[PDB]
């Protein structure tokens, strides 16, 4: 129920399901973006995953334990988005990040545009480590999208 890998986050009422996001299971902890789940509990098969750590400003939440993803973008190299769009199998897209310049420092950012329910898809370094999650960003003048490479802290 917590096997390592990438997962879709789905919602269902009385009728069909909607993919609201994606996340990463690593070391028994599920990692996604806050705006996907609003910090609510998740079902995994017959089990319940309870929120553990989170931070709305970072737009991140972990389930079952503290945030485990520690790898950092090296500030230089190309990365891959492992996009898991609604209704499509996972696909890898390589890109050279740009930069969100903020008053508190620079954050890598990827100019890749996918449906809203792709939120939480992992961004990878060349070793396959998760350097952040896709899906919190800005819309630039022409309507296209740029996502921060959002990473939490492993305490």
């Amino acid at each position: 129920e917590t096997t390592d890998g990438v997962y879709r986050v789905m919602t269902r009422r009385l009728l069909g399901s909607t993919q609201v996001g994606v996340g990463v299971m690593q070391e028994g902890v599920f990692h996604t973006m806050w705006h996907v789940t609003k910090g609510a509990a998740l079902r995994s098969g017959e089990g319940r995953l309870d929120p553990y750590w989170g931070d709305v400003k970072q737009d991140l939440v972990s389930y079952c334990g503290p945030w485990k993803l520690d790898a950092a973008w090296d500030g230089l190299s190309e990365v891959q988005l492992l996009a898991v769009p609604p209704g499509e199998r996972a696909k890898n897209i390589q890109t050279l990040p740009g930069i969100f310049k903020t008053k508190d420092g620079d954050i890598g950012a990827v100019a890749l545009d996918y449906p809203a329910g792709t939120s939480g898809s992992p961004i990878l370094d060349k070793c396959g480590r998760v350097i952040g999650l896709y899906g919190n960003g800005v819309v630039i003048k022409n309507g296209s999208y740029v996502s921060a490479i959002t990473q939490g802290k492993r305490e």
Partner: peptide, 4 residues
Amino acid sequence: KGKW
């Protein structure tokens, strides 16, 4: 909680 913005559990702490």
